[PDB]
Design a protein around this ligand. Structure first.
Ligand SMILES: OC[C@H]1O[C@@H](S[C@@H]2O[C@H](CO)[C@H](O)[C@H](n3cc(-c4cccc(F)c4)nn3)[C@H]2O)[C@H](O)[C@@H](n2cc(-c3cccc(F)c3)nn2)[C@H]1O
Length: 138
């Protein structure tokens, strides 16, 4: 029953084997969801499911450096559904963010921001009811 947009501090930044778990429910008639792993004003990893882009479902991933978005990485496999509960797991690897949704691997995102310890906040926003957001070391 948390509040969106939600800020989850990541003390000391991210590190390989860190597992971030977000539990929530997609709102009815949802338009978009966004996870933003931030390094100061930069966004190291933007994870952005879009429910209506040209009447398609798509997940857009990108990095924002000095107020400029970079080249998008798109995943057409779309495991979110309006009205339904979800679990997003982000596993930090040495070279990638690894994303699984509802216990099924979804995508990996190669680190463009390479100072992982400086990625110290996770912003959670968009059309969801947020149930929980936490992290653990596996
Ligand atoms: O990069 C990610 C960002 O993108 C722009 S939209 C973007 O604008 C560009 C022009 O400036 C391009 O038109 C781009 N594009 C690429 C392609 C394409 C590329 C390759 C192949 C192919 F076929 C098609 N088509 N169009 C658009 O996606 C969003 O505003 C932004 N954002 C999202 C949010 C946000 C805020 C609150 C909640 C939330 F969920 C998200 N707050 N900022 C963020 O998600």
């Amino acid at each position: 029953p948390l509040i969106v947009p939600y800020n989850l501090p990541l003390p000391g930044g991210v590190v390989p084997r860190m597992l971030i778990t977000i539990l929530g429910t997609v709102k009815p008639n949802a338009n978009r969801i966004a996870l933003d792993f931030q390094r100061g004003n930069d966004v190291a990893f933007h994870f952005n499911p879009r429910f209506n882009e040209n009447n398609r479902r798509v997940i857009v991933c990108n990095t924002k450096l000095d107020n400029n978005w970079g080249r998008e990485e798109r995943q057409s496999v779309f495991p979110f559904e309006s009205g339904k509960p979800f679990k997003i797991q982000v596993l930090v690897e040495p070279d990638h963010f690894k994303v699984a949704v509802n216990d099924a691997h979804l995508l990996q995102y190669n680190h463009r921001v390479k100072k992982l310890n400086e990625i110290s906040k996770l912003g959670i926003s968009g059309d969801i009811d947020l149930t929980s957001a936490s992290y653990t070391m596996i």
